[PDB]
Amino acid sequence: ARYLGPKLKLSRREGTDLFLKSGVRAIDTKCKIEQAPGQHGARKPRLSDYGVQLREKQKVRRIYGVLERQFRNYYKEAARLKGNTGENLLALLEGRLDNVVYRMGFGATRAEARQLVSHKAIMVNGRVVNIASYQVSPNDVVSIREKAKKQSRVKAALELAEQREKPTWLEVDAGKMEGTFKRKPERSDLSADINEHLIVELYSK
Amino acid sequence: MVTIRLARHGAKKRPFYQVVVADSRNARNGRFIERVGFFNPIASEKEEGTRLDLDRIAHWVGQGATISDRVAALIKEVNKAA
Amino acid sequence: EEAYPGDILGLHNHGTIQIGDTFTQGEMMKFTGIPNFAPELFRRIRLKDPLKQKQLLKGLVQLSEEGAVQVFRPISNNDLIVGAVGVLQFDVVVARLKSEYNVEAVYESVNVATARWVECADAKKFEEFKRKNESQLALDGGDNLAYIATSMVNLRLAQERYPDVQFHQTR
Amino acid sequence: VTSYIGGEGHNLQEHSVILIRGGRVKDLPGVRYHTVRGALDCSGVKDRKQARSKYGVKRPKA
Amino acid sequence: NIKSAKKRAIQSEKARKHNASRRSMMRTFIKKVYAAIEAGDKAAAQKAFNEMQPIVDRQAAKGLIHKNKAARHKANLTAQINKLA
RNA sequence: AAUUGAAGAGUUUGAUCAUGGCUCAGAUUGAACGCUGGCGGCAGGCCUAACACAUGCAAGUCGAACGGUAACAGGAAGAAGCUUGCUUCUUUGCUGACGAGUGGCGGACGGGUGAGUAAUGUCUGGGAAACUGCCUGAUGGAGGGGGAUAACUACUGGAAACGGUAGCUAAUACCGCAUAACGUCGCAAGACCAAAGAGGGGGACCUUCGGGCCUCUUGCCAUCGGAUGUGCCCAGAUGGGAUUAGCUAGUAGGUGGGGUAACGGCUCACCUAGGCGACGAUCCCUAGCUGGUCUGAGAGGAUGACCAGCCACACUGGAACUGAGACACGGUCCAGACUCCUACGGGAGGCAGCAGUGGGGAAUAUUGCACAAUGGGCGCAAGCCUGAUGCAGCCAUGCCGCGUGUAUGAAGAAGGCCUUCGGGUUGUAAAGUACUUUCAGCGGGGAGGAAGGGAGUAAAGUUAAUACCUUUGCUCAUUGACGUUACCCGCAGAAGAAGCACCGGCUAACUCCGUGCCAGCAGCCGCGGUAAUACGGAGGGUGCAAGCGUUAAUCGGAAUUACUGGGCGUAAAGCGCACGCAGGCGGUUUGUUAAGUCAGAUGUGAAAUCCCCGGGCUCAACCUGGGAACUGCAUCUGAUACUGGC
């Protein structure tokens, strides 16, 4: 279910930084970015309404690590939930445990963030959580395992974690290695090349 | 012969019973007269796990309804007036 | 009834019993007797009755948890090989239209000297083995295992791929 | 009924047995059916390495 | 049929027989009165009637001729016997 | 708060617009097949032959009903294994108990299947002519005798299955008699009907000292009820076919006997001559019905596996019996087809109960564990029975989770691939370097489903009573299939784990070579006869992922049966014309009615599901609390413009 493949390969095809390599140094390059996604990648792919309408959601996935069978469900949920289905969808995607982890900078990438959550390196309100898909409520508190706290990985992660854009809707710490989800992130305090109207549009027919 | 008994609806390993008035000859999950309260054999310890409409139960009893052993082992377990 | 030493009792084999399977009330030990030797070969029952197909196969994967013969079904679904007490491959044909299978079945010659010999041990290495010389590799009624070789030299080189296990016949 | 035999080459002969799939071919009218390769008495296309699901060939030892 | 309740069957056979007898007698005891009606002798009718009435009610309480079946029999007897007689 | 959600594209032509079919993208499945395949949670699993079935089990239980002893157990008047004090014997059924039998209750529940059934069915809403075991409320009754009978015994035919004659014995078995009302009959008079005892005990007195007697506990009878369940009746609705247009003698109704628990042609007799039908009877074809389920923006279309209600069948056909209830899956009788045992004279059986075998088929499971929980039958109770149920096995069949590593890494290796050779690409991908070990493997610790029951103590409980019984606290020992449980913690080490379809257009995704209208692909259009982005291989890419593809099938798109929502001058389509019955529709004004219509109310529309907001399994699927919804029907009271009647 996990990707398990070249990350930069996806980064160049989506044409933006998917934060897959985040780690020590960020903002990509050193891959020949965007100029050769394939062997033919130097091509000038004029693409269909459908094509972009795909590339959008298909990027939103890769930037998280969720796969289709799940993503669809997510969308369904969003649709069911009153309010803009795009921003709801983003809400759901941002409510994922692994996400809340990478966001709180307990790991370099969201890919690294997963390793922990699955390896039972974290918890919720004090029960340990194995599943990467856990939906994080407000007021919930995620904490690195008391048992394995501050290791050769997560320590170096917190480093540039502090050096990122940093979030709003959550409250982080250093030595406690725990954080609270204060509120569900608004549409305004997160954004990118990401378009909601493209992705909600894709699932219609 | 009317009986107030337990029907097992819950799930594998995690039963959720339901206390219910029914004809004794019927099936456990079969046709019944009405639902009165319920029982939760798990519930952990938080807020809940058993409810019964006692005023109804006694109405049926007085209409000559028998009670299952577990059922009464609920009814007096929840006490009566306190 | 109920039995005493020296009698002969019958049970009900469902892939649980083999040959020489010792049964106690608890004492973990196994009787050093029972021969169990290895088959020669030939065959390819390819069936008249133009199929089915189980009843033939079912017939074969039911005369085979018995001790006489034993089948061999390669990884090409068809191509059914049987091997092979001595040379009386006839009871097979006959139990192919008696017992409870209305099949008919005949024979041919098959490029198989061995026999084979049915292998397993540690992982990964085996998956590299069950891949390189798989051409070439079979699977039996009872869901394992076996090779099937063309001669003796091609038998030696196979094992010589090495170093993972016997020999194994076990009936 | 008549049925189509896909791929290059087949072991089929006088009697044999097959499993008829269905779906037509409009080159040869009257053939509304396909025989599933590698099913029953049918052998799969020899040496086929691509889209082997159809034409019924097992992994050629990756 | 190789279930211990075949004794229930032989039991019900006995029962059967017994009932067949009782019932039979009852019905003949009514037929007396019916014959008395067709022959038309009012006294004889009344007699017969008084003879059957307890034998009816009795079998009613004994659970063959049950309940108001008895009632019917006596009622539609009486409504007849004194109708033309 | 609780239905607020609608996409189009390809193909007729030299081209165009319109018509119109075909095809494609979606969702769905009890699926199958091909390639592949590592976990776990939950659910699902003969759709085909209502085809035939070896073997085990699927219904028994009460000695507080009775005669009783065939077994294990305590003790016995006497002898003793004898280790004179414990134990051992002949018998002994006195006690606990219990083989066989009698009787009571249960075998009509529970489980299976969809054969039959176009309405003795179902769904919805009303109704009048009934019954109801066990559980209940109330008022009284339970007096006294009789005759049999299994078992048993003696003969006796039997290969077996089974019995056959005679005789003896008990009961809550069976039968009179007594007693009878608030019951039945009858206008009344008056007539007529019942029953059963068995236990734990115990102060008087005690008599023929069996136990009478006092008492509580349980059981019997009669009548009126409660509840439950089951009959019966009416209307409306519940497939197709007119290339089925007429059907029907108990048929339709009446009167009267009979009958049933109850109305009734249900039956019989007689008397009228009707009854049904194009608002489609009749006859054929098909089919279990519903809650609901999939799809759909909705209206609808399709569908009724799993789950719950109703029905029906239980080898084919027929019939009764017993009983509260059956016209009875594991009862009986008869016939029919088959099969099995036989010492040949004669018998025995029905998996559409669980599991399984053969058969059929593209295809659908273990001859498992346990009564611990829930629930049912018997019992005062302990208890006994229980493939119901709870669990386990198999299968990617599905849904939902998770893993198969995470960081770092170079002008960026070798190799593969394209190259106008300058290089580009596979590609941070690998290596290498650090790092983490869930899930698996091994090893330790260890919740919850468990509530009661079994022995002793106290209760203005009742009692003549501290015994007995019930009750409520208390004390002790104890109660599980799953089960090496869930879950927790260590050990080891990237260690064990990625495949499938696709890349001409719809449609995300490209070139080389091979081949050459050959081999071959294709869902539609359409590729291939010498540079094929379409075939086959390779590189690369795109899309999904323990699955991916193909086939199959339902709805969608399809306004392509158009109620919402279409058409007919020439594209398919106005009868050749006219009259006209039924049917549909009808100018205008007042009065009335108030059915249609509308408003309010009251019943009802089962639970589950769907939906809303919560809650619990680490999340999810799953489980669950409450609410809405069930768009409908019926009755009552109102409004009256339109509609209909007068």
Swiss-Prot record, chain A:
A Gene Ontology cellular-component term: cytosol
GO annotation, biological process: cytoplasmic translation; DNA-templated transcription termination; maintenance of translational fidelity; negative regulation of translational initiation; response to antibiotic; ribosomal small subunit assembly; ribosomal small subunit biogenesis; transcription antitermination
CDD domains: S4 (cd00165)
Record key words, sorted: Antibiotic resistance, Repressor, Ribonucleoprotein, Ribosomal protein, Ribosome biogenesis, RNA-binding, rRNA-binding, Transcription, Transcription antitermination, Transcription regulation, Transcription termination, Translation regulation
Record domain S4 RNA-binding: where: 95-155
InterPro entries: Ribosomal_uS4, Ribosomal_uS4_bac-type, Ribosomal_uS4_CS, Ribosomal_uS4_N, S4_RNA-bd, S4_RNA-bd_sf
SUPFAM superfamilies: Alpha-L RNA-binding motif
Pfam families recorded: Ribosomal_S4 (PF00163), S4 (PF01479)
Sample GO molecular function, one term: structural constituent of ribosome
Keyword ATP-binding included in the entry's annotation: no
The keyword Transcription appears for this protein: yes
Subunit structure: Part of the 30S ribosomal subunit. Contacts protein S5. With proteins S3 and S5 encircles the mRNA as it enters the ribosome, which may play a role in mRNA helicase processivity. Some nascent polypeptide chains are able to cross-link to this protein in situ. The rRNA transcription and antitermination complex (rrnTAC) consists of RNAP, NusA, NusB, NusE (rpsJ), NusG, SubB, ribosomal protein S4, DNA and precursor rRNA; S4 is more flexible than other subunits.
Name by which UniProt lists this protein: Small ribosomal subunit protein uS4
Gene name of the record: rpsD
From Swiss-Prot, chain C:
GO annotation (BP), single: maintenance of translational fidelity
Keywords, comma-separated and alphabetical: Cytoplasm, GTP-binding, Nucleotide-binding, Protein biosynthesis
GO molecular function: GDP binding; GTP binding; GTPase activity; guanosine tetraphosphate binding; translation release factor activity, codon nonspecific; translation release factor activity, codon specific
GO annotations of cellular component type: cytosol
Record bears the keyword Cytoplasm: yes
Coiled coil: none
Keyword Cytoplasm: yes
Locations listed in the record: Cytoplasm
Membership in a protein family: Belongs to the TRAFAC class translation factor GTPase superfamily. Classic translation factor GTPase family. PrfC subfamily.
Protein task: Increases the formation of ribosomal termination complexes and stimulates activities of RF-1 and RF-2. It binds guanine nucleotides and has strong preference for UGA stop codons. It may interact directly with the ribosome. The stimulation of RF-1 and RF-2 is significantly reduced by GTP and GDP, but not by GMP.
Protein known as: Peptide chain release factor RF3
Species name: Escherichia coli (strain K12)
Residues represented out of the complete protein: 357 to 527 of 529
Swiss-Prot record, chain D:
Modification type N6-acetyllysine: residues: K46
Entry's transmembrane regions: none
Keywords assigned: Acetylation, Antibiotic resistance, Methylation, Ribonucleoprotein, Ribosomal protein, RNA-binding, rRNA-binding, tRNA-binding
Gene Ontology biological process terms, A to Z: cytoplasmic translation; Group I intron splicing; maintenance of translational fidelity; positive regulation of RNA splicing; response to antibiotic; RNA folding; translation
GO terms, molecular function: misfolded RNA binding; rRNA binding; structural constituent of ribosome; tRNA binding
A Gene Ontology term for the protein's cellular component: cytosolic small ribosomal subunit
Family (UniProt): Belongs to the universal ribosomal protein uS12 family.
Additional record remark: At least 19 substitutions or deletions in 11 codons can promote streptomycin resistance, dependence or pseudodependence; all but one of the streptomycin resistant mutations (K42R) are associated with hyperaccurate translation and thus reduced translational efficiency. The streptomycin sensitive allele is dominant to resistant alleles.
Oligomeric form and interacting partners: Part of the 30S ribosomal subunit. Contacts proteins S8 and S17. Interacts with ArfA. May interact with IF1 in the 30S initiation complex.
Function: With S4 and S5 plays an important role in translational accuracy.
Protein name: Small ribosomal subunit protein uS12
Organism: Escherichia coli (strain K12)
Gene name in the database record: rpsL
Shown stretch of the complete protein: 63 to 124 of 124
Swiss-Prot record, chain E:
Record GO terms (molecular function): ornithine decarboxylase inhibitor activity; small ribosomal subunit rRNA binding; structural constituent of ribosome
Domain of life: Bacteria
Biological processes annotated in GO: cytoplasmic translation; ribosomal small subunit assembly
InterPro entries: Ribosomal_bS20, Ribosomal_bS20_sf
GO CC entries: cytoplasm; cytosol; cytosolic small ribosomal subunit; small ribosomal subunit
Keywords: Ribonucleoprotein, Ribosomal protein, RNA-binding, rRNA-binding
Segments for region (Disordered): 1-24
Subunit structure: Part of the 30S ribosomal subunit.
Function, as annotated: Binds directly to 16S ribosomal RNA.
Family: Belongs to the bacterial ribosomal protein bS20 family.
Protein name: Small ribosomal subunit protein bS20
Species this chain originates from: Escherichia coli (strain K12)
Gene: rpsT
